[PDB]
C-alpha cells in the first residue's frame, strides 16, 4: 500500500517529480548552477509509454551544465532539485519540453514527457 512522494517544482503543475530513490542528504551532495552534472536518463511519452530517448540504451552517461539552457526547461528545474544518486520520474508538460511543435517523429506537438533521471555525479 506504499505510495510515493511527488513534488511540484513549478506553480502550474507542469513539472512533477516522483522520487523513486532518494539521493544523499548533504549540502556537498547538492549540485549548483553551472556545475557539470553526469546523469543517466530514459525518456518516454506519457500517453504511449514509448521510449524516445535513453542514455541507458546508449550505455553512455549524459553530461551537461546545470541551469544554463543546455537542456529543455524541465530538466534544469528537475536536476536543480536533485542530490547525488537520486533517481526520479519527472512528468513534464508540453511547455517544459518541446512545446507546440514537439520534435521529429518521436515527439508530437503538445506531448507530456516522462523522464526517469538518475543523478550519478557532478563537479565544478
Amino acid at each position: 500500500q506504499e505510495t510515493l512522494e511527488q513534488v511540484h517544482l513549478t506553480e502550474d503543475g507542469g513539472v512533477v517529480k516522483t522520487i523513486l530513490r532518494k539521493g544523499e542528504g548533504g549540502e556537498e551532495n547538492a549540485p549548483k548552477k553551472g556545475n557539470e552534472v553526469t546523469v543517466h536518463y530514459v525518456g518516454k511519452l506519457e500517453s504511449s509509454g514509448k521510449v524516445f530517448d535513453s542514455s541507458r540504451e546508449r550505455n553512455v552517461p549524459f553530461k551537461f551544465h546545470l541551469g544554463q539552457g543546455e537542456v529543455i526547461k524541465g530538466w534544469d528545474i528537475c536536476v536543480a532539485s536533485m542530490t547525488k544518486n537520486e533517481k526520479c520520474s519527472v512528468r513534464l508538460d508540453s511547455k517544459y519540453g518541446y512545446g507546440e511543435e514537439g520534435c521529429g517523429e518521436s515527439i508530437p506537438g503538445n506531448s507530456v514527457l516522462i523522464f526517469e533521471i538518475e543523478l550519478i555525479s557532478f563537479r565544478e
Binding site: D53, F62, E70, V71, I72, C103
Partner: peptide, 4 residues
C-alpha cells in the same frame, strides 16, 4: 535538438 535545441535542446535535449
Amino acid at each position: 535538438a535545441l535542446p535535449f
